[PDB]
Point group: D2
């Protein structure tokens, strides 16, 4: 494998204006067996991304050391300060509210009257039952939970929402969708399948549907930071924090015309954790959706109550980049690497809770720096 990468590098070198540029791009002593035929093509090396650690993050009575891969200065230090504030506040609590990856194909019928007939059929328990039967027959973990349909004339967009064990689930859900569509075509032979993804999923593009209905894991996290911790650790006050949160995260985002971006920098934390843990970094587009809320709490309204709600965290602990060793090391640091053998899907849910809690730590710290 290594020799093949060396040769490809040599061939590529002939096509560059600055062939000496490759000298600083590492490639030696790396496990390419796990990469080939699976994670990347035309490999010429690897890009090292610095990994820092923030923690301990006291979440649901457990302590986590969160790995973060980034090239942005202050991010890890800031997130670490947020964790500290949460720890001194007795820790954070989280809950997974929903779980289901989606795929939203588009099909078309000769007339809108026909597509309406198909939608009505898909809404009967009998129609759902046969579609679920076809969808689920593709893999052990593919378990269809619900369907959401929407028509545009003779076009019909069908959003399939399904469980997928500990996997992020796109390949699995796509395979299930394809067989369900084949089955639907048997019931409606005049139906033309236009695209397995008609952007109704919605995958890797901002979309109100993900914000409102959720995609992947929907999670909520919360904590109460004592007034003394707000002053001594965050170097500010509860009142200033609340004023910034409302006018930045709520009013500011509204003025900017944001759908799902009611937070300070959830995307920084999501991206850093995703890269470190072998997730699909491009999914930061929808996985970053977040609304951050803050209120005065306690005896004299001097304590800070904070919560972060993320309805569409697209994540997994098996498959894709999580198959690589360095990435598995970071997943193991968190205790969620691979399949949860006793209860499939539990490692992915735990990782989603960790992401939401670290986002909250990051929000706390940046808002405090903005307020101060």
């Amino acid at each position: 494998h290594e020799r093949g990468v060396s040769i490809r590098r040599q061939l590529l070198s002939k096509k560059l204006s600055e062939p000496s540029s490759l000298q600083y791009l590492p490639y030696r002593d790396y496990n390419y067996s796990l990469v080939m035929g699976a994670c990347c093509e035309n490999v010429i090396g690897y890009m090292p991304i610095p990994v820092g650690v923030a923690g301990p993050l006291c979440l649901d009575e457990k302590e986590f050391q969160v790995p973060m891969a980034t090239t942005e200065g202050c991010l890890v230090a800031s997130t670490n300060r947020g964790c500290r504030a949460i720890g001194l506040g007795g820790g954070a609590s989280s809950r997974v509210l929903a779980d289901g990856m989606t795929r939203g194909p588009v099909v078309r019928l000769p007339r809108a009257c026909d597509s309406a007939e198909v939608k009505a059929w898909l809404e009967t328990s009998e129609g759902f039952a046969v579609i679920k039967e076809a969808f689920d027959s593709t893999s052990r973990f593919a378990r269809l939970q619900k369907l959401h349909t929407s028509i545009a004339g003779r076009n019909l967009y069908i959003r399939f929402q399904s469980r997928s064990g500990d996997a992020m689930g796109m390949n699995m859900i796509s395979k299930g969708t394809e067989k369900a569509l084949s089955k639907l075509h048997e019931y409606f032979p005049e139906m033309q399948i236009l695209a397995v993804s008609g952007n109704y999923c919605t995958d890797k593009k901002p979309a109100a549907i993900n914000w409102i209905e959720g995609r992947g894991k929907s999670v909520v996290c919360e904590a109460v930071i004592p007034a003394k911790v707000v002053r001594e650790v965050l170097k500010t006050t509860t009142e200033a924090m609340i004023e910034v949160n409302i006018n930045k995260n709520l009013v500011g985002s509204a003025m900017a015309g944001s759908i799902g971006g009611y937070n300070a920098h959830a995307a920084n934390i999501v991206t850093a954790i995703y890269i470190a843990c072998g997730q699909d970094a491009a999914q930061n587009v929808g996985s970053s959706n977040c609304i951050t809320l803050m209120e005065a709490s306690g005896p004299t309204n001097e304590d800070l109550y904070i919560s972060c709600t993320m309805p569409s965290i697209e994540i997994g602990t098996v498959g894709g980049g999580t198959n690589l060793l360095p990435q598995q090391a970071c997943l193991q640091m968190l205790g969620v690497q691979g399949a949860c053998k006793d209860n499939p899907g539990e490692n992915a849910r735990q990782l989603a809770r960790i992401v939401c809690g670290t986002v909250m730590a990051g929000e706390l710290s940046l808002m405090a720096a903005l307020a101060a």
Copy 2:
């Protein structure tokens, strides 16, 4: 020193539920001098991301070999197929339509009548001059182009837009914003500066303002793919490609309630190039905004015309992750590493054009795969 990283890892390991977790996380023989105190803190190692190459991408009469860092199978191969189709079609053309990073702080006055007065003041050629003077004094490259202000009662949101040479510009623009706001405060002492970023920028969150007014570089790219190339390379037809594009990228995205997501997978290409080239990957949120259009072209309407328009590519070739050697290697592969001394900003603009062109190659290929069945 590297021994610092080794000790941190050792201390860290005793706190883990599986103390051998760190075994496969590499850390040795990496230049931490450029990382320490600049790109990351509490360093325990590095995460290798596979880098593949797609090309040549025939763009504006030049040929590029595009590095892509990803763990997603088929992405590089697919993008490479798109490049091939474009090359056989005579190449692609691109134009940078606008350039300016932004920062949108929020300030507040005692009353809305007062904030309305500040808005009117900032809209006069005189008021703007004073602000522009304070802003531009922070840097040679920081040149304020304009202001867009919005009121929500007594709150005033002010969007500062400025060029920044070849740097992405966040730090530069933020520093200029702070000096400009301090000057503004001299004229309106009752003004309270609530936050240097009031989410009106908008940075790293989806926002209609970035889609409509742009942020960073706004770029358009286009190409015509011959009917023979569509059939032989993309394995489909122009008519099928157009039908999928309209019903997926336009109608589908509209049904999903998308603002800026009128494309197939621009985010895949943007993220892969960003990680390879030392950009801020979290900026994929807004940098991925894209509308992909396709239509029939030629004598018999059998050729495929395609265009991708990206109004908010946040990118740079100097500063941040671009200071690291491996990342500079990828920037050098493209011929855009560092500052362009004779024409400040030209390297960053060229990188933005390359990103838009590679996104178009990726769109072509995925749409063909969707259409082909």
Copy 3:
């Protein structure tokens, strides 16, 4: 002539005596007199005392208005009503009343109807039906609101809620619950049928009973507002576009090439190019959610005002995506469809209780309740609205394409 107050009648005497204004009917002889007295009192307060000379008020039936549709009444505003049709829809022919002050709107809609008629008519289908109300409640902690969401998601939890909700009316039938969390806040979207009524009052009453029941199981729950903007009523919202509100309807027709050329004065190809670049691409560039159409709001508003609907509901009722494509053997005929997911409409209650508005509803054959099939009149009216919108879209798009 006005004699002392203790002795007090004439207009001057009542006015002299007054100096509530809004309580004039509960004091004066008839309805028209209370209004007349209200106008005289008001005139004194105007920089221009004779402002009201041309605001009509006489010979109007205020009995149905007082304490039901409007307060502090000083008269009525006449809105011209025109008719467009026949609209050939689902093998029936409709004469559609349109109340507007916008020139060319009725004439243009009438031309669209003509093109549809010559094309063999239009077909429509009601895809969903259910008015909503989205209150916001709060628990002490997010962990508690998460528990409430889960309980509401159980078949037994939803059962008790539905029973309480359904107990408020015979027409009130809870179809589903969409719950959304924001920290310790819980937004609950109740969706239910409501016979032929638009349903706002009915659904609000049912929501109040349902929340009271929910409070029995979760005493720490604080009901913040019966409407937490999650409905969403009278504000643009992605939730209405994606999940629907009121009636979701689709309509379609095929216009022959000859009709496109001779009636619409354009070509199928030009019509399609304008539709894609205006209604799809243009709306996307403007950052629209639900506004993928040319002027659905013009038609919706005109029909609403004529038929006694809540005109303010045009905000969400106007959501529409208009699609056009080539059809037929030669591929030169024009296929058009309009999809409107959130038409908020009714044929009983509110403004539909007034006689002039009932006249327009009767013109369409949908006035009042449908005793044999509850909800059928409201569904028919929704189909008529969608079909008239399509007629209007056809005509405006043709004008834009041909430069008229």
Copy 4:
């Protein structure tokens, strides 16, 4: 008389004219051109329509007599069969910018006027409200296409040069003494170019004037770029009568802000609640709730109710309530003990006018006169329309206050 002898085409009976129409000799819509009296044409159309209805007497209660159709015909409506009376109520006085207004509201929604009236009372007892017009400019957003994206990029660069803009501005402004092309916002989508023209329009809402200026400006632009194709005078980039982020962010028509402080005592006595309760409802409903619903511009309780009622009463285009209703309502604890209520309403896109369209009808002018803004402001062109926009924003704030208080009360 037979159809033939009826070749006298006020000398024919309604029955004879109806016979001609049924025999296909006359199109029903052209009735006004043949009949020498507007109300008679309305009368005949009603009779023709009756015979087409499943219920022939359904028009009995639709009024049509004694209405001035001369101002309507060939201007405001076609195929007229009568008029629809909408009840008009009054809310006030609205104490705004040291003036007192009696606001007419046309509606069929119970409690609306009473509620708005209560909000006005709270504002009055609080010392009144203040407002400011932040921007003014109607828009039109056509879409044109060039052969290639490289060409559309060139046209965009050209329009951005001071000299390229001057030429376009000259052509645009030549259509009216009230037209003043303030700015151009251009957006590219491949080879398509969307150009948003923005200009003042005196006291008119301005759609007609701005569309005429745009048509002239594009013709001029075509002289410089003959390869350019004008696809549609409106490419939905305006944006007119459809929800759109562009109107929310850049404004359309008049952008206005209004504010007031309601004393704790007034919140209790008039609104029957507390400042704390009202703030909790406002944040969780108008900000958080609207965010959860995926709203762009709908950060308010019921601005659309007030906008629609005033629009119908004053002869505005009611269909424009779609974008004119955009509003963000903010409430904040004010005062020595955080018990007084600060409130503000910001509406960036109020599309309104006091001349032209429905404002040409007499009953509508009566309502505009009640407010003191009817017609053109001779002394300061545009001032009447700006004053009406301020009144709308202030009445919306009164309505928001009252509904939020009712929601907070239970």
